[PDB]
Amino acid sequence: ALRFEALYPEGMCPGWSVVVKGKTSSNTSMFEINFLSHPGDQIAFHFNPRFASSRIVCNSFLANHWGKEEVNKTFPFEAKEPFQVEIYSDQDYFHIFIDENKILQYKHRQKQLSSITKLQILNDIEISSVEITKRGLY
Amino acid sequence: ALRFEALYPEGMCPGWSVVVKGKTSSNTSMFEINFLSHPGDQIAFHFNPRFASSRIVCNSFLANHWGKEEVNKTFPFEAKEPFQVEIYSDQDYFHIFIDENKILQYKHRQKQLSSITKLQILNDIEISSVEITKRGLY
Ligand SMILES: CC(=O)N[C@@H]1[C@@H](O[C@@H]2O[C@H](CO)[C@H](O)[C@H](O[C@H]3O[C@H](CO)[C@H](O)[C@H](O)[C@H]3O)[C@H]2O[C@@H]2O[C@@H](C)[C@@H](O)[C@@H](O)[C@@H]2O)[C@H](O)[C@@H](CO)O[C@H]1O
Ligand SMILES: CC(=O)N[C@@H]1[C@@H](O[C@@H]2O[C@H](CO)[C@H](O)[C@H](O[C@H]3O[C@H](CO)[C@H](O)[C@H](O)[C@H]3O)[C@H]2O[C@@H]2O[C@@H](C)[C@@H](O)[C@@H](O)[C@@H]2O)[C@H](O)[C@@H](CO)O[C@H]1O
């Protein structure tokens, strides 16, 4: 189920942060935050915390296929407890912070960063806030 | 021109805050922030700062007609200068704060508040941030 979508047609990458606060409803489901590129609604970045297995799966869906999964060594979420996830893009990575701690980086596979105009948040997350902010590049 | 859209299908009213930060590009154009209700994409609240005339026009577009304009001349904007607009809904009004000053309140005309699932930001605004927060008091 779609919980939140945002569209910024001029392209929200690189140099933008998405900050999502919320918590899961279940102990053993999952949610995803996807960054989609236009045209095609390809998934440039899929961030998928899976609470049954305590694994964060990251991937891209390009040319009608999922690529190689990048699975983080740790799982800094707790089911049913509030978290903050920030995803910030630079020229080379999506950088993921959870509760203000740097957790992982994911190298861009879709290189056409300015085509990433759409954010979707799906499945088991009760959102308390979404912030989309133009940070720039440092 | 659509600059930003957000969809929150469970309803973002009442008790949510939307904070928009940005600046205009022109000295004498205009932008609008619209809260839309589903089904129908009716405009529950249209917030339209008009820089040529220094007037904030507020209205609703329901049953295929604009209603009575509620116009504020406080116009605490300056062309090309960063601003912060916060729109917070309670059970009775949309409350508007600009640069942390309360400017106006607008009584709900669309009474089906939970049907307000969509935010659109159009025309002459260069967005630097959009934040959408439940329990908009915090
Ligand atoms: C079984 C399969 O086809 N793939 C397994 C991997 O699961 C997919 O992992 C992807 C990330 O690498 C996505 O998370 C994907 O789900 C998303 O995409 C699909 C379309 O592909 C749907 O839109 C989902 O709604 C969306 O979340 C995962 O596939 C889904 O879950 C699988 C377990 C399976 O039930 C699929 O049918 C379902 O679409 C899995 O991570 C990997 C390791 O276990 O094994 C692959 O086989
Ligand atoms: C001329 C007219 O039809 N209406 C005048 C008022 O202008 C409209 O004001 C509305 C709020 O009360 C909206 O701001 C509207 O613009 C929005 O909606 C229209 C569709 O109705 C379009 O989608 C626009 O893109 C959108 O911003 C205003 O109408 C627009 O501006 C007018 C000046 C005119 O050019 C219209 O054709 C255009 O749609 C105006 O504020 C009022 C002042 O007294 O006079 C009304 O007649």
Residue numbers in the entry:
A (entry chain C), B (entry chain A): 3 to 140
Study authors write:
Galectins are multi-purpose effectors acting via interactions with distinct counterreceptors based on protein-glycan/protein recognition. We report here the first crystallographic information on the N-terminal extension of the carbohydrate recognition domain of rat galectin-5, which is precisely described as an N-tailed proto-type-like galectin. The overall fold in ligand-free and -loaded rGal-5 is composed of two antiparallel β-sheets (F1 to F5 and S1 to S6 strands) that form the characteristic β-sandwich structure.
Our attempts to crystallize rGal-5 bound to the blood-group B tetrasaccharide were unsuccessful. Thus, we decided to test chicken GRIFIN (cGRIFIN) as a model for the binding of this compound. These crystals diffracted up to a resolution of 1.14 Å. The GalB moiety fully superposes with the galactose moiety of lactose, forming H-bonds with His46, Asn48, Arg50, Asn59 and Glu69. On the other hand, the GlcNacB moiety is rotated in the tetrasaccharide compared to the glucose moiety of lactose. The GalA moiety establishes two additional H-bonds, one of them linking the 6′-hydroxyl group with the NE atom of Trp66. The second one extends the binding site beyond the S4 strand, linking the 2′-hydroxyl group with Glu32. The superposition of the lactose-bound rGal-5 structure with the blood-group B tetrasaccharide-bound cGRIFIN gave an RMSD of 0.69 Å for all Cα atoms, showing the similarity of both complexes.
